[PDB]
Enzyme design. Structure first.
Site, PDB file in Angstrom:
ATOM      1  N   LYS C  11     -44.362  -7.193  69.598  1.00 32.32           N
ATOM      2  CA  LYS C  11     -43.953  -6.172  68.522  1.00 32.32           C
ATOM      3  C   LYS C  11     -42.942  -6.720  67.434  1.00 32.32           C
ATOM      4  CE  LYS C  11     -45.279  -3.117  72.223  1.00 32.32           C
ATOM      5  NZ  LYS C  11     -44.973  -1.857  72.980  1.00 32.32           N
ATOM      6  N   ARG C  60     -48.301  -9.734  83.654  1.00 26.41           N
ATOM      7  CA  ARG C  60     -47.750  -8.431  83.701  1.00 26.41           C
ATOM      8  C   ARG C  60     -46.366  -8.670  84.486  1.00 26.41           C
ATOM      9  NH1 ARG C  60     -48.269  -3.041  81.164  1.00 26.41           N
ATOM     10  NH2 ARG C  60     -47.974  -4.396  78.994  1.00 26.41           N
ATOM     11  N   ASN C  87     -39.007  -2.133  72.985  1.00 26.48           N
ATOM     12  CA  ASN C  87     -39.337  -2.951  74.109  1.00 26.48           C
ATOM     13  C   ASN C  87     -40.126  -4.152  74.042  1.00 26.48           C
ATOM     14  OD1 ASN C  87     -42.413  -1.679  76.130  1.00 26.48           O
ATOM     15  ND2 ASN C  87     -42.016  -2.087  73.897  1.00 26.48           N
ATOM     16  N   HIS C  90     -46.434  -6.384  74.223  1.00 30.00           N
ATOM     17  CA  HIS C  90     -47.326  -5.577  74.850  1.00 30.00           C
ATOM     18  C   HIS C  90     -48.405  -6.638  75.547  1.00 30.00           C
ATOM     19  CE1 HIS C  90     -51.245  -3.336  75.447  1.00 30.00           C
ATOM     20  NE2 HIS C  90     -51.763  -4.493  75.147  1.00 30.00           N
TER      21      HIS C  90
END
Lengths: 117, 117, 117, 117, 117, 117
Positions: C11, C60, C87, C90
């Site tokens: 991000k 993950r 955050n 992704h």
């Protein structure tokens, strides 16, 4: 929720083994603003105050369970402590007793403040 | 020669980019005893005092030439600064002006002292 | 099971704080082969594709729970994020939607391939 | 409880990827005294013995669950292993079989001893 | 002087030993803006473009003398290369040939741009 | 030129401050094959032997000038030593006295050997 403060401190055994850089940096990299510092003199100790939204629960998670034997690698007691006597540091307990801790150690002027980026 | 002191400080641009942990640690790992600390408020700043034999010339070598463009990787300006305006920090200049610097910033009591290991 | 792919991205807030080195390295050290990369322009973003057996669930676990407040130190959101808005990154959601994600961003030729050591 | 020993070893795949520094350091920083070392020759391997109160359970927590897919980032298999075949290392199983392991690999004299600081 | 560009690349031996994170980060921490990236396929390779005042001479100093045997620890060849055959990377040679290098590898659109903080 | 050996050792003060991980890793990351190790007991000490083309001059450059006050940050004495008494380590002096050093400490069998990747 916003702009809450908390109180960390570094016990005599931390200071003596050369850990003050390490602790401070872990707080910098999460995002939290530093707002007062000093030292004092058994052995000596380092006092601080950190500000952002949730700094209270976050701090506790960074440090690890109070009994070294229970805490997890990745945290500060997890990577460096072995027993509960010699457990390297203390961090503020609740969004209340943050105050009884701060105000009991830091005079009005010492606390600074500024805007970040 | 023995037990000489010196004066480091962290400019507003260092503090703002999140470098206070990094600097402090490089001093810990060389062997030098830390003996006073505080913050103050352009932008804010961090002041310190470090003690051991030769702390004066050693400090200067850790920091790197004052013109970033001239300094060497491995040092603090070598790994993090680009121009002379925005050059991250100041370190004490000579075993004399250590005093004019210290005494002008730190009141008598603030300086602690203790024996190491 | 073998030779499965997945899709990570960085991000605008990660990129801006200087984290692209950090993320990439954590993937290198686990063992996973890198197979395509590029950048794009709110703010800019970095896209990638990683290959090995189980790269999907492993990714993950490296990143940490999506709500910073829930994630654990040692992981990427655990060491660097504070809220769910800001955050940092992704990572691909399932061994299916790896494709809908990959194929929607990366043209046929861009994906390379080679044998390791 | 006091002065208990345990046995770590580094598999051929660890040694080959360049991990012997990394492992050893994680033991140094927790506080545990090192007390014997050697190498041997499939592929080569490194043997060691570590001493302090609880070194047995602590070691196991530093290494991570034996099935990489189950272990947590922050630990040694969590940051570096992918499958159970190629899982980087072995650590002593119980305060009993510490002995059957030690005594089967290390002759009387090899084990040194000294007081710390 | 201002807003000059330069061209780094990562040889097949770097990529293969797991160094792409390491290189990228050393550029992030000095202050320089990243502005295009991609991979390609002997062995594969990674291409980039970095922007700020003096990025040309700075890059060369970060990498180290082209003959490993001549270069200094603290730099990239100093910490990781041994001979001139297998010397890990290439960095742009002069503020002229930055162009003949860039323009020969990167199509018009690929180069992005944005303002920092 | 090929397959030359050299001899490093870790003085009592290194061992005591927790540096054995650090040293070993700097040798791993340059590319050099490790080929024998052990410990021994003033204070204890660690002995080793490292193999590749030029390991002799490279080692000396990694360690830094013998008088701490003269050595450069980025090297082992540069980052950790202060005086010549307490200077952390010893490394082999010349492609001759590598032997008088090795052969005087390491019995025939202890030295292993293997092919890398």
């Amino acid at each position: 929720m916003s702009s809450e403060r908390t109180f960390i401190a570094v016990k005599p055994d931390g200071v003596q083994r050369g850990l003050v850089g390490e602790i401070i940096a872990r707080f910098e990299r999460k995002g939290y603003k530093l707002v007062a510092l000093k030292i004092l003199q058994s052995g000596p100790i380092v006092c601080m105050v950190w500000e952002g939204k949730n700094v209270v629960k976050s701090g506790r998670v960074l440090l690890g369970a109070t009994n070294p034997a229970d805490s997890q690698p990745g945290t500060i007691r997890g990577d460096f402590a072995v027993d509960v006597g010699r457990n390297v540091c203390h961090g503020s307990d609740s969004v209340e007793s943050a105050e009884r801790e701060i105000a009991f150690w830091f005079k009005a002027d010492e606390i600074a403040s500024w805007t970040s980026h």
